[PDB]
C-alpha cells in the first residue's frame, strides 16, 4: 500500500522537478516504491508543491531528497515525515474543479459598475457597465473616451471585477 | 564649498551631502555636544530645526531674512515625524500627548 506525501520544490521549476523525479525512479529502479507524481492544474494550485504516491523507507526518502531542486518533505518531523489524509480524498474525487465549474455559466465577476479592462483593445483602463450580454458573453462597459462614457463590447475574461 | 540654500533630500527633508551634489556640511553629533557645553540654546535650535529640517520653518525664515526681520518660527523637525512613522509602522503606538 502506497500513501501520499508532499514535496517542496523551487517554485517555478516544478514540471522539471516532476520529470527529474520520474527519471531518478527509473534510474535507481525502485519501481515498486513509487506510484504517481501529481502537479494539479486549473485552467495552478498548489503553488510549488509536488504530490508523490510513495512508501516510506529511508532509501526512498534519500532518493526523493537527492532529486535536484527539491528542498524536502513537509510534515510533523524530518525523521518520519507525514502523509496527508484519506477522508478528504472521497469528497475531492467527486469534485476536482471548484475554481472553474459550470455552476455559474454567466457572471464571472460582479457586474454593478466597477470593472477594469486589460485583455482587450483598451488595456489598463476601467469603466461603468450598464447592461451586459452574459448569454452571448458580452459586456457594455461605458469607458471614459474623449470626455464621454462610450460603451465597448468586452470579454468577461478580458475585463476584471 | 559653500551653500546658502540648495536642494533637499527626499525621504528626510535635510540637505544633500557632498560637493558635486550642492550640499551642506554635516553639523555632527559632537558639535551638538559642544553647543550644549556652552549656553548657546538658540544657535542649536536654529541649527537643527530652521536651517536644516523644518520646511515651513525655513520658508518663513527665508522670507524673514530677505525682509530684514531676523526671527525664527520653530516648528518640528520633519525627520522626527519620520521616526514616528518608522516606530509606528511596527506594532508600537508612539504618540504626542496633551
Amino acid at each position: 500500500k502506497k500513501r501520499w506525501y508532499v514535496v517542496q520544490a523551487f517554485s517555478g521549476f516544478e514540471g522539471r522537478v516532476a520529470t527529474s523525479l520520474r527519471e531518478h525512479i527509473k534510474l535507481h529502479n525502485m519501481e515498486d516504491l513509487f506510484g504517481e507524481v501529481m502537479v494539479p492544474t486549473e485552467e495552478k494550485f498548489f503553488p510549488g508543491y509536488v504530490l508523490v504516491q510513495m512508501v516510506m523507507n529511508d532509501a526512498s526518502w534519500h532518493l526523493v531528497r537527492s532529486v535536484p531542486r527539491v528542498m524536502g518533505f513537509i510534515g510533523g518531523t524530518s525523521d518520519r515525515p507525514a502523509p496527508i489524509s484519506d477522508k478528504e480524498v472521497d469528497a475531492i474525487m467527486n469534485r476536482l474543479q471548484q475554481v472553474g465549474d459550470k455552476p455559474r455559466p454567466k457572471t464571472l465577476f460582479e457586474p454593478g459598475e466597477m470593472v477594469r479592462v486589460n485583455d482587450g483593445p483598451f488595456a489598463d483602463f476601467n469603466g461603468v457597465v450598464e447592461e451586459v450580454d452574459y448569454e452571448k458573453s458580452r459586456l457594455k462597459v461605458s469607458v471614459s473616451i474623449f470626455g464621454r462614457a462610450t460603451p465597448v463590447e468586452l470579454d468577461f475574461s478580458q475585463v476584471e471585477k | 564649498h559653500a551653500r546658502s540654500t540648495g536642494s533637499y533630500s527626499l525621504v528626510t527633508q535635510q540637505p544633500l551631502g557632498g560637493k558635486a551634489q550642492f550640499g551642506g556640511q554635516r553639523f555632527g553629533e559632537m558639535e551638538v555636544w559642544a553647543l550644549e557645553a556652552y549656553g548657546a540654546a538658540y544657535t542649536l535650535q536654529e541649527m537643527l530645526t530652521v536651517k536644516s529640517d523644518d520646511v515651513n520653518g525655513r520658508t518663513k525664515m527665508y522670507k524673514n531674512i530677505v525682509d530684514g526681520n531676523h526671527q525664527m518660527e520653530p516648528g518640528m523637525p520633519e525627520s522626527f515625524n519620520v521616526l514616528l512613522k518608522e516606530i509606528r509602522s511596527l506594532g508600537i503606538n508612539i504618540e504626542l500627548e496633551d
Binding site: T77, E88, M114, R116, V128 | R3, Q25, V32, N81, L90
Partner: protein, 301 residues
C-alpha cells in the same frame, strides 16, 4: 498600482491637487473622488504621513516581544524561549484550557503527544499551535490573579534564585496592569505599513528603479498573505497551511527585525536587506544619523 502597495484611494494623489488619472486641474473642488480614478485630492507631502495596514491572514507574534532577551512573552507566560519558538514555527502544539484531562495549561504537546491524546480525549480538548494558540494563552491570562499569586509566592519562599526569578516576573505583570497595554497586543493581527514617501521609489540615472528594501519586505508579506487567503478559501490540508502560515510568520518577523531569526533574507546579491528595526538601530539609524546629527544649510568647508 490600483490597488497595490503604492495605491491612490488608500493613500493620496501623486501630484498636488490633481487626480493622477484625470479630473480637477485647477483650485476649486479639492476632495471629490470619481469612480474612474479611485483617488483622494490633497498635497504632495500628504502621503508621507498616511500609512496603510496589511490584514495578515494568519496571526504572527512580534519578534521584539519574543526575542528581546529577556523576551516579553517569555517571562510572562512562564515558558522557556526554546519551547515558545517551537510552537510558533509550527513544530509543537500547545494546550489551552483542555478540561477534565490529565494535562497542564503551559505544558506543550508533540505530534505523538497529540495523536494519542486525539484518540484519547476526543471530546472537550483544546490544543492549538502557532501565534493563534499563543495569543489565546495571553488573552486568557488573568493579570490581577497572577499578581497576588506571584506576590504570595515571593512571601512564602526563601530561595534566593527563585526570589529574583519571581520578582522579575511580577514586575512586568503589575506594570502591564498599571497601563492600558493588553496581553493580546503582542501578536500582530493588523500589520501596519510605512508611508511610501518614507520608503521612496526613485530611479537612478538610467531607465530602471532602484527599489528600497522595505518594498521587498512588504511585497513578500503581501504575496504570502494573498496565498494564505487563497489556501484557506480552497481548504488545503493541514501541512500545506502550516507551511503557509509559517512562511507568513517568518516573513513578518523578517520585515520587522531582519536577521534576529536564522540567516537573514537577501535580494542582491548575498548582502541582507535592511528592515524597519535596522532603520532605527545602529550607527546609521535615525537617532545617530538624522536626529542627533543633521546636515546643515548656510555652511561651508
Amino acid at each position: 498600482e490600483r490597488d497595490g502597495l503604492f495605491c491612490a484611494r488608500i493613500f493620496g494623489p501623486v501630484k498636488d491637487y490633481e487626480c493622477l488619472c484625470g479630473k480637477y486641474k485647477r483650485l476649486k473642488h479639492r476632495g471629490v473622488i470619481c469612480e474612474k480614478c479611485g483617488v483622494e485630492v490633497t498635497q504632495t507631502k500628504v502621503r508621507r504621513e498616511r500609512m496603510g495596514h496589511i490584514e495578515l491572514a494568519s496571526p504572527t507574534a512580534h519578534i521584539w516581544f519574543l526575542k528581546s532577551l529577556p523576551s516579553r512573552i517569555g517571562l510572562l507566560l512562564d515558558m522557556p524561549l526554546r519551547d515558545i519558538e517551537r510552537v510558533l514555527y509550527f513544530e509543537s502544539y500547545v494546550v489551552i484550557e483542555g478540561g477534565m484531562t490529565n494535562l497542564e495549561r503551559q505544558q506543550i504537546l508533540t505530534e505523538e503527544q497529540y495523536l494519542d491524546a486525539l484518540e484519547e480525549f476526543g471530546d472537550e480538548f483544546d490544543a492549538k499551535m502557532g501565534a493563534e494558540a499563543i495569543q489565546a494563552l495571553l488573552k486568557s491570562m488573568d493579570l490581577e490573579q497572577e499578581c497576588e499569586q506571584l506576590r504570595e509566592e515571593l512571601n512564602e519562599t526563601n530561595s534566593e534564585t527563585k526570589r529574583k526569578k519571581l520578582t522579575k516576573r511580577i514586575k512586568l505583570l503589575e506594570a502591564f496592569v498599571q497601563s492600558g497595554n493588553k496581553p493580546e497586543w503582542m501578536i500582530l493581527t493588523v500589520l501596519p505599513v510605512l508611508p511610501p514617501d518614507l520608503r521612496p521609489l526613485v530611479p537612478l540615472d538610467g531607465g530602471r528603479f532602484a527599489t528600497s528594501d522595505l518594498n521587498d519586505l512588504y511585497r513578500r508579506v503581501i504575496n504570502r498573505n494573498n496565498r494564505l487567503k487563497r489556501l484557506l478559501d480552497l481548504a488545503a490540508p493541514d501541512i500545506i497551511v502550516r507551511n503557509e502560515k509559517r512562511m507568513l510568520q517568518e516573513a513578518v518577523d523578517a520585515l520587522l527585525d531582519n536577521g534576529r531569526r536564522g540567516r537573514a533574507i537577501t535580494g542582491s546579491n548575498k548582502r541582507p536587506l535592511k528592515s524597519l528595526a535596522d532603520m532605527i538601530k545602529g550607527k546609521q539609524g535615525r537617532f545617530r544619523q538624522n536626529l542627533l546629527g543633521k546636515r546643515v544649510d548656510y555652511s561651508g568647508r
